[PDB]
Nucleic acid binder design. Structure first.
Ligand SMILES: [Mg+2]
Ligand SMILES: [Mg+2]
Ligand SMILES: [Mg+2]
Ligand SMILES: [Mg+2]
Ligand SMILES: [Mg+2]
Ligand SMILES: [Mg+2]
Ligand SMILES: [Mg+2]
Ligand SMILES: [Mg+2]
Ligand SMILES: [Mg+2]
Lengths: 141, 184, 71, 98, 50, 179
RNA sequence: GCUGACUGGGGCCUGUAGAGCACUGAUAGGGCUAGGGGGCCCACCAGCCUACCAAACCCUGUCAAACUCCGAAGGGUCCCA
RNA sequence: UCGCCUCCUAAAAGGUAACGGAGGCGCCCAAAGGUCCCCUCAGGCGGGACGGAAAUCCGCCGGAGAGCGCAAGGGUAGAAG
RNA sequence: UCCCCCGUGCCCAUAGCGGCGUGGAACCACCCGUUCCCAUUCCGAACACGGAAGUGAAACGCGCCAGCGCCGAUGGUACUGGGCGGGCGACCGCCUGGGAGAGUAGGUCGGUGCGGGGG
């Protein structure tokens, strides 16, 4: 999958999901990008499932830029166990994405391709998405 | 590129937009006024104007002063403009972003790879009067390996730069085909 | 300064098998010496102790140099 | 920065700050909290003798002389990079006990 | 504490006490020290056991 | 009376002034310090010290050395928070000349060997720093007192700057060089 | 026997929200570049190339309850009402 | 699991729970105490006899990332080192 | 009163770092020495003493520059006392006060008391 190589703490509280995006709202790298429209924990297996979908659509071509990173520990208690006895074990890792974050984005591929490519990856994600392309993203001078 | 502005006394910015306008501001050394522009009209300009070309504003005083966007703050969600910063041009030397027009088919593409345009601009200082349009760039010749950058561009008359200039501006990276899964 | 420990400090002789040398000021009288017997700086040295005893005198520039190999 | 500045250990009022120059030996009786220098006395910059550990032994009682005229009879010593030695400058009066 | 061992300090000029801790092994054995008494005050004290 | 002394005041001093030089009687390349660390051959101290390097090497330069001690943890070097492993000696002025001069052109020699001093070895402020294969072999020998082949590493800090100003000072003072 | 809750005005005490990487860690790509597969190899004296691995470091993008260069709203307390 | 210490959870005073998250203590030091006087680190880059990539040296650059008996935090070179 | 320098404090980077000026008449420093008080884990390097040939090189003082550092608006957000609503939920919106952090324009190579020596 995709996950941190080291850590200071193996497990962490759940935290909340209010707010916009904090950052990562403009294209920055490629020509097109997939933006999140709802709050959600995107799991490593979801990210992978999307990325492969990408590389799979446009076989041998362009560059894909995964911009979200699963570094937050997802926990789960053993099958059929009661409440108590301490915190559960790490089942996987997630990426906390809030409305507006540009999760993925492609480069070096025909427009038509960028579309169907990003559309598919959307389906793999557990939230509503929107495709876009460089615009007022030139945050400069 | 002509875009009209209007003055703002000091009444709820939330209203301006809940209307159909886009609040903003004008400034440089001297002068700094709270102004605004029609949203749907300012967009049509910026789409091409961007921050690479000078946006000539106006006002009631019929004074068409030259400027260029210093920064546009977005809405994060809804992702649309929410406020603009207009920089009024003078005669003094100013630093801006001049678009790099990478022309040519890099040998690395036909071969194997994608032209990742690491930097589609480059802040450079210059004279308002003398503002370039686009700094062309020689891309043909770039193979799969590393790629040209920063200190490798034809800097027009009276236009140096505020770069490293080691800052890589482009690089050809091999393409992604099949064969995946490394964690067996 | 520092009282005690310190050496003695006294002049003696720097002998030399090739003429006098440095002026006493250390703590040793006798010694093999040999300042350099050939300096060494760039040249005047490199006395490369390889001298094939009595070089030349035999096997020298003979046997018939290159010759009319040109023909 | 040979730093030092032990003077920071100064609480009790009136510090007689000194100076060990190659030619002269200055001295100020300053009262902080007010940031004012009350009395003073310089080396040959005030004219006197010619010998180091000598001019000092007197450049002191001089300052001590003036100081008493102002009732300033109690102070604390100093000299940042001091080392209390040589030009030590002992002196009567100036109820400093030092 | 097994090795430290807590002992007292006798006035040697007579009785008295104060008491502290030692460390037999670590650089030690027999404790002599200046301590102010109560039964006159101003003397040297040795170890003991109690 | 001093040996080199003249060599620098009389010679070198002028050749530089005009080859460089100019203006001040101070901004002229000249040495100011001569330190030298042993380290303790191919095996350090040990509770049973060594100190012979001290007593001996001490007077092979005329004046006892000090004793430095490690720091930090070792692990695979055998040492600890240190103590000792050092034993070095600085020293300037007189002894600086006497040690290297009454040993520069007469001592350094003899030791069965090659060309001159390693060229590319200077830096800035011109200080150089050679470092014989330790080898306590000569000068001032007076045998006996022979336990280890411990020798040293000499450090020579000079004024000057760059490498020429520095090198010029040594080269024109009596420092055979480059291979 | 006016000191109460509550409130107005002062003075500070603080590190949450938010945000941000300067610290501690986590981070994708790129540049540059110790190494190490290894590559043309004139063979020890370096060497040259590399759509592999890859330090440290810089650039672009981010992440944190046990990170903070920064930092609200508020809250606490004392004084006068 | 049961007493004690550090950090978080704790919502910027204090306090605050759960078989919540993550680590320590049941000692030690006669010098690791008192006072007086001196001294300033870690690393980075050079240059260096054996020298790993930190032994000890020399030269710059380096406000603290070193050090402070042991956990963690706070503190600290204008010293507590 | 007014400039220069020597000691001293306050403000604690717009008060520094680094380049480039320059200064010795005086003070200061480097130096000349180290018999003497005094010293170094070893060195008069540092402390320290006695000096006075030479010097401003070093160090320091005083100017110059914006490149690093630092300072940093105005606007607009975020967030939020208090009040009132929406969504199954994850969350979100309006009213009224307060209101960042980043970013941008731009600012800065100090300001300033007391006592001394000197024009
Ligand atoms: Mg009342
Ligand atoms: Mg009350
Ligand atoms: Mg109140
Ligand atoms: Mg926080
Ligand atoms: Mg937060
Ligand atoms: Mg209050
Ligand atoms: Mg609390
Ligand atoms: Mg609270
Ligand atoms: Mg002590």
């Amino acid at each position: 999958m995709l996950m941190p190589r080291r850590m200071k703490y193996r497990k962490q509280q759940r935290g909340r999901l209010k707010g916009a995006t904090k950052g990562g709202d403009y294209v920055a790298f490629g020509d097109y990008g997939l933006v999140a429209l709802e709050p959600a924990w995107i799991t490593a297996q979801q990210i992978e499932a999307a990325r492969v979908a990408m590389v799979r659509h446009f076989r041998r071509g362009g560059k894909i830029f995964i911009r979200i990173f699963p570094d937050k520990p997802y926990t789960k208690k053993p099958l059929e166990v009661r409440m108590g006895k301490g915190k559960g074990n790490v089942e996987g890792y997630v990426a906390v994405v809030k409305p507006g974050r540009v999760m993925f984005e492609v480069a070096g591929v025909t427009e038509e391709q960028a579309m169907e490519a990003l559309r598919i990856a959307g389906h793999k994600l557990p939230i509503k998405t929107k495709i876009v392309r460089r615009d007022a993203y030139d945050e400069a001078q | 590129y002509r875009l009209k502005a209007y003055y703002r006394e000091g009444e709820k910015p939330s209203a301006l937009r809940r209307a159909g306008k886009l609040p903003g501001v004008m400034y440089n050394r001297h002068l700094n006024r709270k102004v605004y522009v029609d949203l749907v009209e300012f967009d049509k300009v910026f789409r091409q104007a961007s921050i690479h070309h000078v946006i000539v504003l106006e006002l009631p005083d019929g004074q068409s002063l030259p400027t260029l966007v210093r920064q546009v703050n977005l809405d994060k969600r809804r992702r649309r403009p929410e406020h603009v910063d207009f920089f009024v041009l003078s005669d003094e030397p100013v630093e801006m972003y001049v678009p790099l027009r990478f022309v040519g088919t890099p040998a690395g593409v036909r071969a194997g790879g994608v032209l990742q345009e690491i930097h589609r601009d480059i802040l450079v200082k210059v004279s308002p009067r003398n503002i370039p349009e686009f700094i062309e760039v020689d891309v043909s010749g770039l193979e799969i390996g590393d790629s040209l950058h920063a200190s490798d561009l034809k800097l027009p008359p009276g236009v140096e730069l505020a770069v490293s200039p080691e800052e890589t501006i482009a690089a050809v990276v091999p393409p992604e085909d099949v064969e995946k899964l490394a964690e067996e | 300064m520092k009282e005690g420990i310190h050496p003695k400090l006294v002049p003696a002789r720097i002998i030399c098998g090739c003429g006098n040398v440095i002026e006493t000021y250390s703590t040793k009288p006798e010694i093999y010496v040999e300042v350099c017997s050939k300096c060494h700086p760039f040249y005047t040295g490199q006395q490369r102790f390889v001298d094939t005893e009595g070089r030349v005198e035999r096997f020298q520039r003979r046997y018939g140099d290159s010759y009319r190999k040109g023909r | 920065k040979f730093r030092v500045r032990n003077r920071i250990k100064r609480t009790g009022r009136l510090r007689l700050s000194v100076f060990r120059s190659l030619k002269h030996i200055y001295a100020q009786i300053i009262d902080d909290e007010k940031g004012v220098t009350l009395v003073s006395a310089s080396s040959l910059a005030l004219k006197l003798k010619g010998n180091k550990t000598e001019v000092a032994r007197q450049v002191g009682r001089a300052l001590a002389e003036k100081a008493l005229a102002l009732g300033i009879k109690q102070v604390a010593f100093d000299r940042g990079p001091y080392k209390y030695h040589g030009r030590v400058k002992a002196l009567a009066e100036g109820a400093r006990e030092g | 504490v097994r090795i430290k061992l807590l002992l007292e300090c006798t006035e040697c000029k007579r009785r008295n006490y104060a008491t502290e801790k030692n460390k037999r092994n670590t650089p030690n054995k027999l404790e002599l020290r200046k301590y102010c008494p109560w039964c006159r005050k101003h003397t040297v004290h040795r170890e003991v056991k109690i | 009376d001093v040996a080199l002394k003249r060599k620098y005041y009389e010679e070198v001093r002028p050749e530089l002034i005009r080859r460089f030089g100019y203006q001040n009687v101070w901004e002229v390349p000249r040495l100011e310090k001569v330190v030298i660390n042993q380290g303790l051959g191919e095996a350090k101290e040990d509770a049973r010290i060594l100190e012979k390097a001290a007593q001996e090497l001490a007077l092979i330069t005329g004046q006892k050395p000090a004793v430095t001690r490690a720091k930090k943890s070792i692990s695979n070097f055998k040492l600890r928070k240190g103590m000792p492993i050092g034993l070095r000696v600085t020293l300037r002025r007189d002894r600086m000349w006497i040690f290297l001069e009454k040993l520069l052109n007469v001592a350094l020699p003899r030791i069965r060997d090659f060309r001159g001093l390693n060229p590319n070895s200077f830096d800035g402020r011109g200080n150089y720093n050679l470092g014989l294969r330790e080898q306590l072999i000569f000068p001032e020998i007076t045998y006996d007192m022979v336990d280890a082949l411990r020798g040293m590493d000499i450090a020579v800090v000079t004024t000057a700057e760059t490498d020429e100003e520095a090198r010029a000072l040594l080269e024109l003072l009596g420092f055979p060089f480059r291979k």
